[PDB]
Structures are given as structure tokens and as C-alpha cells.
Amino acid sequence: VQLQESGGGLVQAGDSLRVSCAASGRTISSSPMGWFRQAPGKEREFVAAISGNGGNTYYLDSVKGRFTTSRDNAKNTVYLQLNNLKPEDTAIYYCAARSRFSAMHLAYRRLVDYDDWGQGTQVTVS
Amino acid sequence: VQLQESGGGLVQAGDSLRVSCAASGRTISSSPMGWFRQAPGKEREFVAAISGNGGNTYYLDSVKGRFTTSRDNAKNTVYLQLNNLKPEDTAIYYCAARSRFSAMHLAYRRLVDYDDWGQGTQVTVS
Amino acid sequence: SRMVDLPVIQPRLCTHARWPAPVYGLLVDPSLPSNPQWQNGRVHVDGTLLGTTPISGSWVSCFAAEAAYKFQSGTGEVATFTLIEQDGSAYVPGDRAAPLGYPDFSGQLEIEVQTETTKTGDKLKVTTFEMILGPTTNADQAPYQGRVFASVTAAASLDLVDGRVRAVPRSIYGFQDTIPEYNDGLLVPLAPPIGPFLPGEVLLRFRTYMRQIDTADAAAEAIDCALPQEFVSWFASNAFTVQSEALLLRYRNTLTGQLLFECKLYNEGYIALSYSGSGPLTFPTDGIFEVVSWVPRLYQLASV
Amino acid sequence: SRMVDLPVIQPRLCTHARWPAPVYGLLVDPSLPSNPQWQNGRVHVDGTLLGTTPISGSWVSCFAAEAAYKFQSGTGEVATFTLIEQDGSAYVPGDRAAPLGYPDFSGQLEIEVQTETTKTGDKLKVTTFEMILGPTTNADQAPYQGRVFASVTAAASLDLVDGRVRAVPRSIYGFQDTIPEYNDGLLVPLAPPIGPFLPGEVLLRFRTYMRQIDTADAAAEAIDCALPQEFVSWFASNAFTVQSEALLLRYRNTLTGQLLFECKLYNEGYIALSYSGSGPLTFPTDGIFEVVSWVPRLYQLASV
Ligand SMILES: [Mg+2]
Ligand SMILES: [Mg+2]
Ligand SMILES: [Mg+2]
């Protein structure tokens, strides 16, 4: 219900970063979770989602093979591993949770699909 | 099109008034025309409409038999005759023209159906 | 062919031939004109399709088109539809009013199409447009000529890609059971008015209700057709040898065989009952039509 | 009865049995699940309807209900649908998954219903809701029990009146061809998987495309069925006498008489071709299916 992100920072192209999204107030072990990124002055864009049941993920074409997300149900935490980072990746990274009626296989890919949002954590790629 | 209303006024329950909606800049001879009234602090609501071809009219149930509308193409003017007025008719009366794509038999009923609005004329019933 | 028969389906289990919804009502109503010029749900008993009547229920009050989209300030997003037939074959202006299944009634339709945007983060969704049918418009609709227009209010361009659509009907506003603007104010080739009838004969009506926009009145919007779509597809699928001008049908209770009414199915594809009452008479929708025999056109029915 | 025959209609003029749209494709594809458990479009040649299969194509992927509406800060407008059969008859849990024509696939559906408000100068309009189908949900959907839940994001209560609806499908999001949540995670009575097939036989697929929400991919969403709705209503309508396990059909160019392929219509309502290959093979959609003869279950077709 409450989403707290950490990780990310300033790196050069080709480096890796680890974004963590820690949930409190309620479990996300059955919540569809998404990753969005926003460069201030541009629209928030979809990066990645994990289905409610954890069995289906989906990635923005441009990050396929670079970014991977997983949910650790025990730690109530979702992770975004950002490998082979590029200048285009420079953004505030947001986790989001869906708490409304959900199909549990569906990796939700739209901003209107989600209900609760982290504060965001900045990734800068030099 | 520009819509200039006049008429209205103050009368006792059971007296009758006229509102005139004079068009300038363009012809309303084929324009669907609507009447809405708004008591300030309440929402704008449908009263009467005349279809583009002038052949269909529709009235709010509670005013049917009391109010009529007709369009005079020569004078480029739509008229609302308010007969047998009641305190509950107290409002600003607005005329409206629909300029977009129209079914010409259709007495358009909704605020979202109209494009151009008059400034309104006040009717007060004691 | 074998002797004409009918599919053994209760009217309440059938598909309407003018609006894509269940048949809900079976009735006669002498207060309505008995000679409507419906263009869909028109078929001869020998299977010859009349007007814009398609075989598939799914085509009814729909259209297929190559869609082109523009943004116009003061109007919103404008769709220009170049019509094709709903199987994707070329539409050729010809001996009928429009592509098969094009709406044959008037008013203002909400339609839905698959749209594709160039907008980043988006691609496919379904967009609702407003489409004027008639009976007359200020927008020059000519589905006879293969071209029609829709539009929806929008603050800014929806940035839509040109592409193939199938428009399906969402709602009707100011419904009128009169033919739409097929050709920008001009006549087109039409199926003839339904008829003629013997003195005391009236049209049997299969009735559905249309999803509606209305501001005051909650009353359902009725639309009638001459035959359910299943009887349309049956006649098209069978190509029967026709012996007489008319077939005598008995509509019967399935359990008791109790006669509810006898009627004439004219081989021009409309059903008459002999009824001299002033107002509507409704019938049970769980009966079965049984083909009794060929009868001459002049056959006088027992009154209902 | 007379010998089993088929309605003389080209597949491209027919209605899809699982989604209310035209039949667009005819193919085999042995990379797709071989024995799907589709609940709509399921009929025996003797006319026996299976699963939730309706007679009318208009019932396909739809439902009817008594709707109750409430507004909830955080969710918006919630609909409780107490299901009824689409002819307006009472739905009773019985020997099938759901009311006839209830969707037999998974994902998130946008649905449209007639809504009534007690807001000023509004009364009737059509409202889009989100409806989670499956395969599993956090919504406890139980159409087998006669209860399903839909919702639409709303900043304020829409002030909807409770009343009768018929839910029609606007789009699919996250489509998966697996049965939905019929009974909140519990088992229900189902039509058996399509089959069995001889080694080397594959299912003949009648294909349409579903209006779609998709943020990235413009590829149309395919859905297959065993038989077009016109064939379902034909078997239902005729109650044929059945001899052997299978009928040999020839699919033929009407205009040239070219044989495109022969196939077996098993009595249990599905068509098999002998196809040795790995990937899709598509066929012309403008041929006609002709009944040649009864044949044994074990009859080996000429390969395509
Ligand atoms: Mg109405
Ligand atoms: Mg549950
Ligand atoms: Mg897709």
C-alpha cells in the first residue's frame, strides 16, 4: 500500500544499478507491480511489469535483455536490475502497485492500470 | 455565430414572458438550437430544443404545455415563450446553437451537444 | 429441393435482423404502418437476399472501411470511412443502398472501432465516435457512394493511424425507424415497402431494444424486423423451390401443440396475421413456427 | 431425419462462435494447443448443445444480469451483476460452467451496459466497465453461482439506478485462450476437451480477431472456434439421425470445383484434417463444405 524506493545514482554508460521497491501496510505477494520512468518535462513511460501471480513479466522493447524485474514475496519487495545502462535510461524510476480487481496473469502495461506509487529514485547515465 | 438574448424579467406565478435569441455573424436557419436554464449555485439543465430542419421540438416534461420554441429564419432569431410561469422556473435562460455534424430531425438534449452560447437572460417568478 | 421447412428455434432464442441483439418480442401493432421499407432482414423464401440484408447476424447495423483520421479545431477528431464489405471484399455502388448490413434506420449512432496511435506509450485501443445516420444530415453521408463520416469531441489530435476498421454500434440517440441518408439526399435502389396485404392482414413484428442515450425518458427503444436472422440464413442456405405465393404457418406451444395463431409467410418474406384490434397484441416468444402447406395469395386467415 | 447436410455458406460469410464478429480465417496450426476446452461453439451433429453454447450468435461472449451499483473512494464505481440467461429467464446453477454465451476465455474485458442515472437532465447512456475474466482473479468471479463483479475508475459516484443489463464486449486486454474463473477457483461442469484426433490429425480452426487494448504491438488478437455459429444453429435446428463416428467433408471452390482439402466432421462437433507439417497452413475462406459420406472414426484422410 506504501511503496518506498531506494538504489540508483550516477553511473557511466555500460554500468549496472539495482532499484528496490519496499512495500509496507500490506503484502504485494499477489499485487500486479509495474516500473515506470520519467525525465522531468516528459511523460512517465512503462519499463516493466510483473503479474499478480508472479508468472508473467513484460519489458519495454528498448530494455529487453538489459533490465529484469522480480518480486521477493517474503521481503514484500520488487527489484529492477538495470544492466548495460545508456544515456536514454536517465530518469526517475517509479514502482507502482495495482490494488483494484486484477487478472493475475496480466503484466499491466498502462499508467491508468495502477493505484499506488513510490516516491521514485533517480538514475543518471553519463 | 454570436447569440444575443433579451426579454426575460420579473412577473408573478401564472404570468408569461418571452426570451429572444438573435443570431449575428452566421445563419441559424439550419442550426439545431437549445434552451437551458441555470439558477446560480445549481447546474445548467435542458428546457427545450428545435432540430436543425425546424420540424422536431422536444421539451422538459415539467414545462411541456407551458413553454414553446420556434425559429424565425427571416429574422435569424429563436424564441422561447414561457407561459404559465411558476417560482421553480426562476433562472438565467440560455440559448445555444450546434454547429458540428447533425442529424437534422434530432432535438439535441445535452449540454455536450451544443457549441455556441448566449450570455443568458434573467427570468424571476414571485 | 425438399418442401419448405423452418429451423425449429423459439423466437426468444433467435437473433434480430436489424439490430444485433436477441429477439425479445413477437407482436402485431396496427397503430404502426404495415408497409415499412426495411433494407436488412429482407429475403425471399427461395433464398434471394433483398436490400442490404447479410447472411451473418454479426454484419447487422455494422460497417467495414479503410478509415482516415484528421484533427479539426472546433469539431474534434474526424474519421473519413471508405467503405468495403465486411468480409474485406471491394464495395461497388450497385443494385442496393449500401454495403451489406449497413444500418437501415435513422438518428445518431455511437460506433466503436479499433484505432492505432503513433502516441509514445500507446498503440491499440477502441475509440467511440458519433455518426449521424439521418434521416437527413448536414454532413453529406453517402454509404451508397462508399463514403461516410464520424467525429468525436477531442481537446487535441488523437494521433490515429489510417487502417481497416469494423464499426460496431454502441448506442442510438433520436432513433427514427425511417431509412438513413444513403446518398446525400438522393434516392438509391431500395427493397420495396413490405406488402401488399389482404384487407384485415397486418405485419408480424420480431422486436428487440437498442442501447440508448436519452435525457428524461427511461423507456426502451423498440426496433422491429420481418424475420429473425436465423430464418434469413435458413432461406439463403437452402434455396427452396417455391410452389405458391404464400405458405400457411401455425405458431404452436411446444408442449401442448395449442395453436397460438396461424399466419401467411408470403414468399416475398414477410408474415401476415388477420387481426382487426385497435392496439398492440403481443405473443409468447417460446412457441414454434410449423409450415402447414402452400396456400394462394388470396387465402383468408382465421382472425387472431 | 434426412441424410446430414450443411448450410451452403462460405466461411467468410459466417459468424464466429466464440467472439461476436465475422469469420475471417480458416487454418490448421499444430503449434497451438491440440485439444482446447472451448465452452462456446460446442455442439454434436445430432443437435445436442454442449457447455455454454447458445443458438444465437448475439449471445456469444455476452451476459445479462440484474445490476447493483455502488461508489467506493479508492476504486470508483463497482457493479454487482446477478446473472440471468440472455432471454431474460432465471439463471440456475446446473450442468454447465455459466449462463449461455458467457465468455470461455481469459484476460480483462471492457464491457458496455445500458445505465440509468438520477442525476439532473441525464437519464439513459451506455457506460464502459472493466470486467476481469481470468484465468485467476482477486475478484472472486463466480458466473457458475450467478455473480460477477465489474468496476470503472471514477472521481465521484455515477449515481446509477439498479436494473437489468446485457453486457456486450468492447475490447480484450491480456487475452489468454484458457477458461475463465467460473466458480472462484473451484471446478464446474465443463464440455470435455475437443478431440480425440487420430495420430497425424489436427483441429480445423475458424478464426476471427478481437478488438484489443495493447500499448506496444499492433498485431491483431486471434481467436479460434471449432464451427461457425451458422453450423451450431444448423445442427441444433435439424436434430439429424447419426450413423458412424464421422462424416467425410470436401471443401471445394464453388466456381471451379477444385478440391482444396477433405476433412472429417466427428459427431462430437469438431473437424480434423490430416496435416504432417509443423507450422500454420491457411485456406481460402470462399469455398463450400460438402457432405460426402459417413466414414469410420479410424478413417485416414488424404493429407493436406
Ligand atoms: Mg428514448
Ligand atoms: Mg477468489
Ligand atoms: Mg496484442
PDB file of C-alpha atoms in Angstrom, chain C residues 2 5-9 12-15 20-22 24 55-59 86-89 110 112-116 121-128 166 168-171 210-220 230 233-234 236-238, chain D residues 2 5-9 12-15 20-22 24 55-59 86-89 110 112-116 121-128 166 168-171 210-220 230 233-234 236-238:
ATOM      1  CA  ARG C   2     -37.408 -30.659 -50.313  1.00  0.00           C
ATOM      2  CA  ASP C   5     -39.398 -26.013 -43.662  1.00  0.00           C
ATOM      3  CA  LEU C   6     -38.256 -23.624 -40.881  1.00  0.00           C
ATOM      4  CA  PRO C   7     -35.442 -24.021 -38.329  1.00  0.00           C
ATOM      5  CA  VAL C   8     -37.051 -25.367 -35.071  1.00  0.00           C
ATOM      6  CA  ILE C   9     -35.872 -22.411 -32.860  1.00  0.00           C
ATOM      7  CA  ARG C  12     -36.795 -15.799 -27.871  1.00  0.00           C
ATOM      8  CA  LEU C  13     -33.674 -17.900 -28.808  1.00  0.00           C
ATOM      9  CA  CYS C  14     -33.213 -16.088 -32.205  1.00  0.00           C
ATOM     10  CA  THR C  15     -31.129 -13.117 -33.405  1.00  0.00           C
ATOM     11  CA  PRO C  20     -27.503  -7.089 -33.202  1.00  0.00           C
ATOM     12  CA  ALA C  21     -29.344  -8.230 -30.044  1.00  0.00           C
ATOM     13  CA  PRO C  22     -31.765 -11.036 -29.020  1.00  0.00           C
ATOM     14  CA  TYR C  24     -37.389 -10.171 -27.178  1.00  0.00           C
ATOM     15  CA  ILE C  55     -26.352 -13.783 -44.110  1.00  0.00           C
ATOM     16  CA  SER C  56     -24.306 -13.272 -40.856  1.00  0.00           C
ATOM     17  CA  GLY C  57     -26.098 -11.693 -37.836  1.00  0.00           C
ATOM     18  CA  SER C  58     -22.671 -10.130 -36.931  1.00  0.00           C
ATOM     19  CA  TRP C  59     -22.848  -7.794 -40.022  1.00  0.00           C
ATOM     20  CA  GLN C  86     -17.411  -6.731 -44.013  1.00  0.00           C
ATOM     21  CA  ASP C  87     -15.556  -9.783 -45.421  1.00  0.00           C
ATOM     22  CA  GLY C  88     -12.992  -7.200 -46.729  1.00  0.00           C
ATOM     23  CA  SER C  89     -14.109  -7.537 -50.422  1.00  0.00           C
ATOM     24  CA  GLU C 110     -22.226   5.847 -31.201  1.00  0.00           C
ATOM     25  CA  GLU C 112     -16.685   1.711 -31.792  1.00  0.00           C
ATOM     26  CA  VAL C 113     -13.587   0.923 -33.925  1.00  0.00           C
ATOM     27  CA  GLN C 114     -10.079  -0.454 -33.286  1.00  0.00           C
ATOM     28  CA  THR C 115      -7.721   2.568 -33.517  1.00  0.00           C
ATOM     29  CA  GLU C 116      -3.891   2.559 -33.665  1.00  0.00           C
ATOM     30  CA  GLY C 121       3.422   4.531 -24.682  1.00  0.00           C
ATOM     31  CA  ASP C 122       0.211   3.600 -26.608  1.00  0.00           C
ATOM     32  CA  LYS C 123      -0.758   1.620 -29.755  1.00  0.00           C
ATOM     33  CA  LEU C 124      -4.180  -0.177 -29.881  1.00  0.00           C
ATOM     34  CA  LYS C 125      -7.407   0.836 -28.122  1.00  0.00           C
ATOM     35  CA  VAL C 126     -11.116   1.122 -29.035  1.00  0.00           C
ATOM     36  CA  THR C 127     -12.393   4.650 -29.823  1.00  0.00           C
ATOM     37  CA  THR C 128     -16.084   5.715 -29.651  1.00  0.00           C
ATOM     38  CA  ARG C 166     -15.224  -2.668 -38.485  1.00  0.00           C
ATOM     39  CA  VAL C 168     -19.995  -1.792 -34.343  1.00  0.00           C
ATOM     40  CA  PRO C 169     -22.930   0.020 -32.735  1.00  0.00           C
ATOM     41  CA  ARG C 170     -22.651   1.201 -29.068  1.00  0.00           C
ATOM     42  CA  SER C 171     -25.881   3.288 -28.771  1.00  0.00           C
ATOM     43  CA  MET C 210     -31.480  -0.738 -28.693  1.00  0.00           C
ATOM     44  CA  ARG C 211     -28.901   0.616 -26.132  1.00  0.00           C
ATOM     45  CA  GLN C 212     -29.929   4.277 -25.843  1.00  0.00           C
ATOM     46  CA  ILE C 213     -28.831   7.832 -24.967  1.00  0.00           C
ATOM     47  CA  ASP C 214     -31.870   9.782 -23.628  1.00  0.00           C
ATOM     48  CA  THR C 215     -32.090  12.632 -21.028  1.00  0.00           C
ATOM     49  CA  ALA C 216     -35.603  12.244 -19.417  1.00  0.00           C
ATOM     50  CA  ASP C 217     -37.320   9.050 -20.728  1.00  0.00           C
ATOM     51  CA  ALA C 218     -36.208   5.605 -19.385  1.00  0.00           C
ATOM     52  CA  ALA C 219     -38.497   3.747 -21.909  1.00  0.00           C
ATOM     53  CA  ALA C 220     -36.588   1.103 -24.008  1.00  0.00           C
ATOM     54  CA  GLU C 230     -31.897 -17.442 -38.364  1.00  0.00           C
ATOM     55  CA  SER C 233     -29.794 -17.519 -43.096  1.00  0.00           C
ATOM     56  CA  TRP C 234     -32.058 -20.671 -43.460  1.00  0.00           C
ATOM     57  CA  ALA C 236     -30.294 -18.192 -48.093  1.00  0.00           C
ATOM     58  CA  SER C 237     -28.686 -21.616 -47.154  1.00  0.00           C
ATOM     59  CA  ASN C 238     -31.489 -23.855 -48.625  1.00  0.00           C
TER      60      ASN C 238
ATOM     61  CA  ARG D   2     -32.802 -36.736 -43.987  1.00  0.00           C
ATOM     62  CA  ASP D   5     -26.262 -31.836 -44.755  1.00  0.00           C
ATOM     63  CA  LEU D   6     -24.558 -28.439 -44.135  1.00  0.00           C
ATOM     64  CA  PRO D   7     -25.733 -24.839 -44.695  1.00  0.00           C
ATOM     65  CA  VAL D   8     -24.448 -23.724 -48.181  1.00  0.00           C
ATOM     66  CA  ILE D   9     -22.448 -20.693 -46.875  1.00  0.00           C
ATOM     67  CA  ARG D  12     -16.082 -15.758 -44.846  1.00  0.00           C
ATOM     68  CA  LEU D  13     -19.884 -15.019 -44.774  1.00  0.00           C
ATOM     69  CA  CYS D  14     -20.380 -16.817 -41.391  1.00  0.00           C
ATOM     70  CA  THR D  15     -20.445 -15.676 -37.736  1.00  0.00           C
ATOM     71  CA  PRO D  20     -19.265 -11.749 -31.921  1.00  0.00           C
ATOM     72  CA  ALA D  21     -17.536 -10.905 -35.220  1.00  0.00           C
ATOM     73  CA  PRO D  22     -17.141 -12.255 -38.790  1.00  0.00           C
ATOM     74  CA  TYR D  24     -12.022 -14.124 -41.230  1.00  0.00           C
ATOM     75  CA  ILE D  55     -28.158 -20.837 -30.545  1.00  0.00           C
ATOM     76  CA  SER D  56     -27.969 -17.065 -31.272  1.00  0.00           C
ATOM     77  CA  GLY D  57     -24.553 -15.612 -32.207  1.00  0.00           C
ATOM     78  CA  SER D  58     -25.690 -12.396 -30.392  1.00  0.00           C
ATOM     79  CA  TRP D  59     -25.366 -14.300 -27.015  1.00  0.00           C
ATOM     80  CA  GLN D  86     -29.901 -13.592 -22.022  1.00  0.00           C
ATOM     81  CA  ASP D  87     -33.599 -14.356 -22.942  1.00  0.00           C
ATOM     82  CA  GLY D  88     -34.497 -12.776 -19.519  1.00  0.00           C
ATOM     83  CA  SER D  89     -35.122 -16.181 -17.836  1.00  0.00           C
ATOM     84  CA  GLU D 110     -14.168  -3.782 -21.330  1.00  0.00           C
ATOM     85  CA  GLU D 112     -20.841  -1.961 -22.244  1.00  0.00           C
ATOM     86  CA  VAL D 113     -24.189  -1.791 -20.449  1.00  0.00           C
ATOM     87  CA  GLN D 114     -27.273   0.485 -20.532  1.00  0.00           C
ATOM     88  CA  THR D 115     -27.089   2.744 -17.434  1.00  0.00           C
ATOM     89  CA  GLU D 116     -29.754   4.963 -15.847  1.00  0.00           C
ATOM     90  CA  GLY D 121     -31.167  16.152 -17.146  1.00  0.00           C
ATOM     91  CA  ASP D 122     -29.269  12.860 -17.637  1.00  0.00           C
ATOM     92  CA  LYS D 123     -31.205   9.555 -17.597  1.00  0.00           C
ATOM     93  CA  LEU D 124     -30.015   6.902 -20.158  1.00  0.00           C
ATOM     94  CA  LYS D 125     -26.494   6.341 -21.541  1.00  0.00           C
ATOM     95  CA  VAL D 126     -24.036   3.467 -22.194  1.00  0.00           C
ATOM     96  CA  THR D 127     -21.236   3.016 -19.602  1.00  0.00           C
ATOM     97  CA  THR D 128     -17.969   1.057 -20.161  1.00  0.00           C
ATOM     98  CA  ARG D 166     -26.964  -7.023 -21.154  1.00  0.00           C
ATOM     99  CA  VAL D 168     -21.602  -6.724 -24.639  1.00  0.00           C
ATOM    100  CA  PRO D 169     -17.821  -6.859 -25.226  1.00  0.00           C
ATOM    101  CA  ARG D 170     -15.936  -3.659 -26.268  1.00  0.00           C
ATOM    102  CA  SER D 171     -12.273  -4.918 -26.058  1.00  0.00           C
ATOM    103  CA  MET D 210     -10.803  -9.371 -31.135  1.00  0.00           C
ATOM    104  CA  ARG D 211     -10.859  -5.566 -30.595  1.00  0.00           C
ATOM    105  CA  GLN D 212      -7.774  -5.060 -28.378  1.00  0.00           C
ATOM    106  CA  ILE D 213      -6.012  -2.779 -25.838  1.00  0.00           C
ATOM    107  CA  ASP D 214      -2.258  -3.164 -26.419  1.00  0.00           C
ATOM    108  CA  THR D 215       0.394  -0.479 -25.590  1.00  0.00           C
ATOM    109  CA  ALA D 216       3.151  -1.747 -27.968  1.00  0.00           C
ATOM    110  CA  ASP D 217       2.044  -4.436 -30.502  1.00  0.00           C
ATOM    111  CA  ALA D 218      -0.431  -3.676 -33.387  1.00  0.00           C
ATOM    112  CA  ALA D 219      -0.738  -7.470 -34.175  1.00  0.00           C
ATOM    113  CA  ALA D 220      -4.477  -8.412 -34.242  1.00  0.00           C
ATOM    114  CA  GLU D 230     -24.377 -20.926 -38.532  1.00  0.00           C
ATOM    115  CA  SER D 233     -27.657 -23.388 -35.099  1.00  0.00           C
ATOM    116  CA  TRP D 234     -27.972 -25.763 -38.149  1.00  0.00           C
ATOM    117  CA  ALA D 236     -29.391 -27.554 -33.140  1.00  0.00           C
ATOM    118  CA  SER D 237     -32.177 -26.776 -35.708  1.00  0.00           C
ATOM    119  CA  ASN D 238     -32.190 -30.178 -37.545  1.00  0.00           C
TER     120      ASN D 238
END
